[PDB]
Subunit: 63 residues, 6 copies
Amino acid sequence: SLQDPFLNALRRERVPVSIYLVNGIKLQGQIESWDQFVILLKNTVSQMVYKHAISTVVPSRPV
Amino acid sequence: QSLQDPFLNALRRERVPVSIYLVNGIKLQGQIESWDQFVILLKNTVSQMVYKHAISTVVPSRPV
Amino acid sequence: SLQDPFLNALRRERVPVSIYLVNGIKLQGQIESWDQFVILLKNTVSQMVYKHAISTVVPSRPV
Amino acid sequence: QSLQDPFLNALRRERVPVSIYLVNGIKLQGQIESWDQFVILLKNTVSQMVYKHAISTVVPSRPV
Amino acid sequence: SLQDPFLNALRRERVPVSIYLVNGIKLQGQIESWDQFVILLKNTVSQMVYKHAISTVVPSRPV
Amino acid sequence: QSLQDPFLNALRRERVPVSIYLVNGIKLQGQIESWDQFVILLKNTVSQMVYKHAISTVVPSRPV
């Protein structure tokens, strides 16, 4: 509900994000796509991140 | 839900800053922007999207 | 089902509790209120604790 | 559910003490008081309410 | 869906398994039984392992 | 689901090896055998059953 427009705003302007995982690890890249359960984060290769493993998605700059 | 919603709404309405402690121990701080069943948007320079499943406690900086 | 009467017993007698989180952290206070997903723990300020982050709720004394 | 319920019931019925290991590695020990879909009540001086989501394993001190 | 036949294959041949938990801990034994939420792992005593706490179930040898 | 399924299927179909990073930080590596709503079967000597709830990220060794 809030997830969709939040992630869409980031994707359409190709705003880089930091995705902090529940274990502290920080991933970085651009939101390429997503569904109910995963976010596809783009960089060199596209990695599929499970939302359940994410603590916070942080834009690098205001959107 | 029936306690979570009025609790968050009261903090947001009076712009009371909060500390959001995550399951990994990291403390986030900011203003409550909005929330749904799954996430809380926490703002200050940017609005970051915090998954509720990753939060342990939400602590106001002062009583409601 | 068991949660409600367990938490209500603690609340009505204002019995102090320790809430141990899944990361080891111990919170302390009195059960002020709760719903399906959170417990409001009272002390100096009221903090909202997600049940999913709790490992065990331990009364300080028999109820 | 169909295995969890008879397993816990057998331990409780014969008052077999258990060790409940939590996801964080802490070991709780006691007697099974009762349980529902979400929690197990573990007793000895007090009854503590243990969320199942936080438990990794329940280990009897002896075979059923 | 995949869980059932995977676990049944291990059980019927009594193939020993290692069950790695989400905290890193490695349990070992034989799959005795399971339901929707737990796996009963047999060894000296039978211990009930919650699936939500498991990261991976690894056969000791090909099945 | 609608992104997860085509993503995993593409990797499996071309036999592209993956690294599966778990929430605890352990890295598993192998070939995707199959998956359902709850688990991914990861193969090489044995097929191991990996619970999705325990995975943080699935990373291909090369673009799809």
